[PDB]
Amino acid sequence: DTYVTKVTDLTGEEEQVLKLEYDRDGKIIKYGDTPVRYEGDQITIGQMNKLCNVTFQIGKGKARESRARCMLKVGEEVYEADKQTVYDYKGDTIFINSDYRATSDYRFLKKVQGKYVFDQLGRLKEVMTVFTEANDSVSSCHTYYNYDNNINYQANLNLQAYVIDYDGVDSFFYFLLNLGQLRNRTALPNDIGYCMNHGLSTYNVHANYRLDDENPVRIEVLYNYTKLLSRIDLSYNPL
Numbered sequence: 001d002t003y004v005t006k007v008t009d010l011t012g013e014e015e016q017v018l019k020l021e022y023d024r025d026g027k028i029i030k031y032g033d034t035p036v037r038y039e040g041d042q043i044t045i046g047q048m049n050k051l052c053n054v055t056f057q058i059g060k061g062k063a064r065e066s067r068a069r070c071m072l073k074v075g076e077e078v079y080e081a082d083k084q085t086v087y088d089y090k091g092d093t094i095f096i097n098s099d100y101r102a103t104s105d106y107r108f109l110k111k112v113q114g115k116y117v118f119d120q121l122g123r124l125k126e127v128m129t130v131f132t133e134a135n136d137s138v139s140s141c142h143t144y145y146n147y148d149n150n151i152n153y154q155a156n157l158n159l160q161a162y163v164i165d166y167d168g169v170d171s172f173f174y175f176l177l178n179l180g181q182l183r184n185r186t187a188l189p190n191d192i193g194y195c196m197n198h199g200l201s202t203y204n205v206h207a208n209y210r211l212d213d214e215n216p217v218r219i220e221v222l223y224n225y226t227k228l229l230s231r232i233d234l235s236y237n238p239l
């Protein structure tokens with residue numbers, strides 16, 4: 001189980017190289033300039049840029065609920081919001097329910113409801129998300145994942161977090177640090193399909209991975225074979 005020491009996000013014309021640090025037990029204590037603290041039954045992740053912080057409540061080996069402070073783009077403007085989330089498990093299936101309120105006057109801003117459905121092998125097969133806006137207007141997405149190419153990796157982090165469907169940087173860390181204590185932290189989807197608002201729009205992408213002796217050293221998501229949508233470069237070297 002090899003350790004990721006450097007992650008490099010390629011967002012536009014400029015790079016973003018983040019150094020990852022670990023304690024004597026292998027626990028992540030830094031993701032770039034974002035610290036990760038462990039106090040009793042809690043995990044607190046510091047500032048990100050987007051996310052101001054998130055505190056996860058750990059119960060019986062899994063995150064049960066979380067609270068985050070973040071910036072939320074609602075209409076045209078962005079609000080300093082408070083996010084309240086609960087994590088529920090029924091078999092392998094994961095229910096994520098989040099409520100966004102303004103820090104200032106507690107005004108309700110957004111509701112996000114996500115369903116993560118896994119197959120027999122523990123692979124994430126489908127993600128269903130429902131977004132309720134302040135005006136009660138509803139949008140949804142159904143995401144489907146294909147594993148026919150049988151791409152498998154071995155790493156300390158749950159690298160699926162760099163390609164799967166989640167709401168917010170707190171959900172990114174929730175999956176990346178395996179706070180849901182997922183049965184399969186080995187498979188990578190080769191293709192992803194999106195069906196928005198029951199067919200009003202659809203989108204299909206391909207995930208491309210270059211592996212350096214079983215470790216993914218590059219994660220790419222492409223549209224129509226050539227339009228690069230995201231590129232994450234990873235290092236496993238101690239430095």
